[PDB]
Design a protein around this ligand. Sequence first.
Ligand SMILES: Nc1nc2c(ncn2[C@@H]2O[C@H](COP(=O)(O)OP(=O)(O)NP(=O)(O)O)[C@@H](O)[C@H]2O)c(=O)[nH]1
Ligand SMILES: [Mg+2]
Length: 162
Amino acid sequence: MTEYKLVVVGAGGVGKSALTIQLIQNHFVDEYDPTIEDSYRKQVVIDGETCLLDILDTAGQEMRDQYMRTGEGFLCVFAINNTKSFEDIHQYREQIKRVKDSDDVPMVLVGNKCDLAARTVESRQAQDLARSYGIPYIETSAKTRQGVEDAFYTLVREIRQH
Ligand SMILES: Nc1nc2c(ncn2[C@@H]2O[C@H](COP(=O)(O)OP(=O)(O)NP(=O)(O)O)[C@@H](O)[C@H]2O)c(=O)[nH]1
Ligand SMILES: [Mg+2]
């Protein structure tokens, strides 16, 4: 069946793992557990198509080129309460473009932790950025599960149209 190789990237502690686990195991992980590199394979049906989501959950800690080269689509995540994580996004996109020799790579910008009230990054800020990249912007919360499937499925549809 069709396999979609997705890679979740972004600064440390933004919730890359929490988002993935919610999608796969349907539960919110609320504990300190820094990732080195984990992969999740799940059979799913998206828009009537039977497919295998091969998800690579990466480390935020400063091996990148290797996984960016084989990835078909990327979920670039930042936390809406961490301005630095938002600014780091540029670095990730640039590295992905460089590795894939492409100006356009299936990508989705994800603003996570939208359940928190202490927001420091305005949605409009992220939307403008997303628009300049030419990619979708989706706000999520691994805690409430809002936008989770949305983020992942949109990335799949983006790969389908590339
Ligand atoms: N309130 C709230 N907390 C969240 C959300 N997503 C993740 N967190 C919390 O943020 C912390 C870090 O999440 P984690 O998934 O481990 O982040 P990471 O980006 O995967 N970290 P690392 O890059 O080191 O691997 C955890 O305490 C987790 O519960 C969210 O949507 N809302
Ligand atoms: Mg992690």
